[PDB]
Amino acid sequence: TLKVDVKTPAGKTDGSVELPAELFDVEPNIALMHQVVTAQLAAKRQGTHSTKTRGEVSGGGKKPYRQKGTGRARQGSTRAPQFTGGGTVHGPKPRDYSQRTPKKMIAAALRGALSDRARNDRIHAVTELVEGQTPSTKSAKTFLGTLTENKKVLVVIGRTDEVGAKSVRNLPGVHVISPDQLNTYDVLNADDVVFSVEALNAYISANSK
């Protein structure tokens, strides 16, 4: 168990959250995380690359000239692969790259990534990114600057907190995610993870229950 002290945008500490060992003390598994991350990038990849085979290229139905007597190499189609403008052999065709990674591997990879941040004290908890119901990037930038000076930050906010999300959205290195969408790639890409208290509790509850 590691304790994260909840910071407020007014500069106060409101409370603590206790991190379960099961979720934030896991030993990092680099080979497992590598498989999970590459699988995620494979699923991102849209397979939309295509080429025409010798049957799909326009024309080419007729045998150009007689088999024998011309003194030229025999040819069956003007669209054979050796021809300029002919069909492509073993060229790209559209394909799905997604992988069916087991659930337990995906979950363990996320726990490993979050544990690595927790051990290095890179996990922060906050009541709100901004006070009130008016988005302000200036407030959020100042407050995040007090929390972390690193460039890339993963901000985990509940669905409802539109004003917090909008307030941080435009900052260059900041990435915003909901706690139910938390994933290894975005955690390992971030220098620091900043949780809304509601989002951190929601994540702990859905897992440790």
Partner RNA sequence: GACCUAUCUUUCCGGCUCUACCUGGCUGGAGGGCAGUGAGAAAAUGUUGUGGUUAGCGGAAAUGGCUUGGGAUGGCCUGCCGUAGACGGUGAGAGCCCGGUACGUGAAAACCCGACGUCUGUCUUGAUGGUGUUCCCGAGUAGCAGCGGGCCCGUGGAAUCUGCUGUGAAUCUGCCGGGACCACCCGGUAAGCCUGAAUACUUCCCAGUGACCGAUAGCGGAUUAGUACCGUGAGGGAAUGGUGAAAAGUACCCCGGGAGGGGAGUGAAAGAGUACCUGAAACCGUGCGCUUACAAUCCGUCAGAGCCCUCGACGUGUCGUGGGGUGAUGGCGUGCCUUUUGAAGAAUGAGCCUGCGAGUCAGGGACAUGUCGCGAGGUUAACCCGGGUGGGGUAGCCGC
Partner RNA sequence: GGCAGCCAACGUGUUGGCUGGGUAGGGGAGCGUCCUGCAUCCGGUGAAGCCGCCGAGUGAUCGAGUGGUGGAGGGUGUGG
Query: Per rule CB under 7 A, is residue 34 in the interface with RNA?
Result: yes
Distances in whole angstroms, Cα of residue 64 to Cα of each of 55, 78, 79, 187: 16, 7, 10, 61
Shortest reach from residue 58's CB to Mg ion, in Å:
5
Are the beta carbons of 167 and 137 closer than 8 angstroms?
yes
Distances in whole angstroms, Cα of residue 29 to Cα of each of 21, 92, 109: 16, 34, 7
Query: Per rule CB under 7 A, is residue 59 in the interface with RNA?
Result: yes
Q: Which of 77, 79, 75 is nearest to 58 (CA)?
A: 79
Name which position in 30, 31, 61, 62 contacts Mg ion (CB under 5 A): 61
Closer of 75 and 189 to RNA (Cβ): 189
Closer of 119 and 175 to RNA (Cβ): 175
Interaction partner, residue 105 (RNA, Mg ion, none; CB < 5-8 Å by kind): RNA
Interaction partner, residue 15 (Mg ion, RNA, none; CB < 5-8 Å by kind): none
> In whole angstroms, what is the distance from residue 31 CA to residue 48 CA?
29
Residues 6+ apart with CB under 8 A from 169: 176
Query: Per rule CB under 7 A, is residue 47 in the interface with RNA?
Result: yes
Name which position in 1, 11, 172, 209 contacts RNA (CB under 7 A): 172
Alpha helices in the chain (DSSP H): 21-24, 30-44, 103-119, 137-147, 162-169, 184-189, 197-208
Residues 76-115 that bind Mg ion (CB under 5 A): 76
Are the beta carbons of 45 and 36 closer than 8 angstroms?
no
Residues 84-143 that bind RNA (CB under 7 A): 84-86, 88-93, 95-98, 100-108, 110, 134-138, 141
Binding mask 7-46 for Mg ion (x = CB under 5 A): ----------------------------------------
Shortest reach from residue 52's CB to Mg ion, in Å:
6
